[PDB]
Design a protein around this ligand. Structure first.
Ligand SMILES: O=[N+]([O-])c1ccc(O[C@@H]2OC[C@@H](O)[C@H](O[C@@H]3OC[C@@H](O[C@@H]4OC[C@@H](O)[C@H](O)[C@H]4O)[C@H](O)[C@H]3O)[C@H]2F)cc1[N+](=O)[O-]
Ligand SMILES: *[C@H]1OC[C@@H](O)[C@H](O[C@@H]2OC[C@@H](O)[C@H](O[C@@H]3OC[C@@H](O)[C@H](O)[C@H]3O)[C@H]2O)[C@H]1F
Length: 324
């Protein structure tokens, strides 16, 4: 796809990853985000045309798209543990409806198909990922939606999964418009996973989207950090400048260090602790509170950074800038 829906220059600023947290961000920052992010499952299309709230914030792409009619949509599509049945065609009617629905919004859509392709917890087979990316990239063309829907192959870039295993998941450059990654606690392995994902994207000639990012294990309102990924115990006080310097400055530095390929990010701005999947007593890891508006210094510094001219923010020229 040769730069289609990929900005020639600049980094798309998007926010996620549930309707309410995105509305709260837009309210608190007094801004219309350039891109907004939700999730849907392919088995039920849960979250596409009506509310789906399963403990990770409310998803409703119809509501989101009406609330932000001149912002890009970013959509994570879960395989719901069924990628092999998806690859064998059992959900093909649902795929068409998903693609036709998203194309009916007449705006740039970034589709993270089977996001975190190499996260073992997603139950994926390499075959099912390679086949289904082929099928979906081709179906976008068959349905006539290739000017509108950009297909993102997003890895998990998660330190406990060993490096050097990305090739088995790759469907081929002809079937991928962007590579994506997750930027949470890359310091746990010296940035090795996120750097490996970036260098993979670079080697394939694809732009890079940081599709999931948050100061994982930090609390912005409380100003704390924990080294405990499972339960968030023995929380450490941080100053707000420390929390900026420890997570936010390196996050933006990573984008500069990879500025040949980085063309978008999604910042997840949420009180994760308020959402039951991510809440105490932490059955699915410790996440924290990533709301930049919950600290004045973090909020100022955030707004000051993303207003800079390497970032693509919302304006009347946004869709043109993104290649729509
Ligand atoms: O301490 N940690 O390092 C830690 C511990 C756990 C943890 O949990 C995961 O958090 C990220 C979240 O994205 C994962 O969510 C799983 O996604 C897969 C789901 O699969 C469903 O399982 C039920 C099945 O019937 C259905 O077919 C299938 O789709 C699963 O439900 C989710 O739990 C968590 F697993 C993260 C971390 N860490 O962050 O620190
Ligand atoms: C990347 O790391 C951070 C996690 O928060 C992300 O997990 C996704 O968070 C948002 C949830 O809405 C999504 O949950 C899926 O939503 C669609 C449902 O059909 C599906 O059952 C549900 O798991 C999380 O995967 C992670 F990607």
């Amino acid at each position: 796809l040769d730069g289609v829906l990929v900005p020639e220059s600049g980094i798309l600023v998007s926010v996620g990853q549930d309707v309410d947290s995105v509305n709260d961000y837009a309210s608190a920052l007094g801004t219309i985000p350039a891109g907004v992010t939700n999730y849907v499952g392919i088995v039920n299309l849960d979250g596409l045309n009506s509310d789906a709230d399963a403990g990770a914030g409310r998803n409703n792409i119809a509501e989101l798209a009406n609330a932000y009619p001149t912002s890009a949509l970013v959509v994570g599509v879960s395989m719901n543990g069924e990628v092999d049945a998806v690859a064998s065609g059992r959900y093909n009617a649902n795929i068409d409806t998903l693609l036709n629905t998203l194309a009916g919004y007449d705006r740039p859509v970034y589709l993270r198909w089977a996001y975190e392709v190499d996260g073992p917890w997603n139950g994926h087979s390499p075959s099912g990922i390679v086949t289904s990316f082929q099928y979906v990239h081709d179906r976008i063309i068959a349905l006539g939606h290739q000017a509108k829907i950009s297909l993102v192959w997003q890895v998990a870039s998660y330190c406990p999964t060993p490096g050097g295993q990305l090739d088995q998941w790759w469907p081929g450059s002809e079937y991928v418009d962007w590579v994506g990654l997750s930027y949470f606690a890359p310091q746990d392995c010296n940035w090795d996973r996120v750097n490996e994902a970036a260098q993979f994207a670079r080697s394939k000639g694809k732009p890079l989207f940081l599709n999931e990012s948050t100061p994982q294990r930090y609390q912005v309102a409380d100003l704390t950090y924990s080294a405990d990924p499972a339960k968030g115990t023995n929380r450490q006080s941080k100053t707000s400048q420390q929390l900026w310097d420890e997570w936010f400055a390196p996050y933006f530095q990573f984008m500069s260090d990879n500025s040949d390929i980085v063309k978008g990010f999604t910042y997840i701005n949420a009180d994760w602790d308020s959402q039951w999947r991510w809440a105490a007593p932490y059955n699915e890891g410790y996440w924290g509170d990533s709301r930049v508006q919950a600290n004045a210094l973090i909020k100022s510094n955030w707004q000051q950074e993303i207003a800079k001219g390497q970032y693509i923010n919302h304006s009347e020229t946004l869709f043109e800038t993104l290649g729509y």
